[PDB]
Amino acid sequence: VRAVIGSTYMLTQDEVLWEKELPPGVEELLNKGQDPLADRGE
Amino acid sequence: LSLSAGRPKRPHARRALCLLLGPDFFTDVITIETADHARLQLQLAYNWH
Ligand SMILES: NC(=O)c1ccc[n+]([C@@H]2O[C@H](COP(=O)([O-])OP(=O)(O)OC[C@H]3O[C@@H](n4cnc5c(N)ncnc54)[C@H](O)[C@@H]3O)[C@@H](O)[C@H]2O)c1
C-alpha cells in the first residue's frame, strides 16, 4: 500500500483501494476542530 | 480573529475577519481595592493603534 497524490489516477491492473482507519477520537478532532486559532475557545 | 468584547471585556465575544489597525479605543471596567480596603470600580478608555 502507498499514497498516490497529485494528478488524476486510474487504478491499473492488480491495484485496489485501501482504507485508512484512525484511532478513536482522532476523527472527532479532524472533522469538528477546523482552525484551533479560531475555535480554540472550547 | 477571535477577539474580546463586552462591558467587562469577556473573551471570545466578537469573531472578525480583517484586522483594523486604526486609532480606535476600547473601554473596560476595572474593580480595584486600595490600601484602606476601599473596593471601588472604574471605567477607563484606551487609545490604541
Ligand atoms: N478615534 C476614535 O475615538 C474612534 C475611532 C473609531 C471608532 N471608535 C469607536 O469607539 C468605540 C469604543 O467602544 P468600546 O471599545 O467600549 O466597544 P467594544 O469594547 O465592544 O469595542 C471593542 C474594540 O475592538 C475593536 N475592533 C473590533 N473589530 C476589530 C477588527 N476587526 N480589527 C481591529 N479592531 C477591532 C473596536 O475598534 C473596538 O474599540 C468603538 O465601538 C469604536 O467604533 C472610536
Swiss-Prot record, chain A:
Localization per Swiss-Prot or TrEMBL: Cytoplasm; Nucleus, Nuclear pore complex; Cytoplasm, Perinuclear region
Tissue localization of expression: Present in most normal tissues. Higher expression observed in epithelial cells with secretory and excretory functions, as well as in cells chronically exposed to xenobiotics, such as bronchial cells and cells lining the intestine. Overexpressed in many multidrug-resistant cancer cells.
Posttranslational modification: Phosphorylated on Tyr residues after EGF stimulation. Dephosphorylated by PTPN11.
Induction: Up-regulated by IFNG/IFN-gamma.
Domain of life: Eukaryota
Domain notes: MVP 3 mediates interaction with PTEN. MVP 4 mediates interaction with PARP4.
Subunit text: The vault ribonucleoprotein particle is a huge (400 A x 670 A) cage structure of 12.9 MDa. It consists of a dimer of half-vaults, with each half-vault comprising 39 identical major vault protein (MVP) chains, PARP4 and one or more vault RNAs (vRNAs). Interacts with TEP1. Interacts with PTEN and activated MAPK1. The phosphorylated protein interacts with the SH2 domains of PTPN11 and SRC. Interacts with APEX1. May interact with ZNF540.
Function: Required for normal vault structure. Vaults are multi-subunit structures that may act as scaffolds for proteins involved in signal transduction. Vaults may also play a role in nucleo-cytoplasmic transport. Down-regulates IFNG-mediated STAT1 signaling and subsequent activation of JAK. Down-regulates SRC activity and signaling through MAP kinases.
Designated name of the protein: Major vault protein
Full-protein positions shown: 398 to 439 of 893
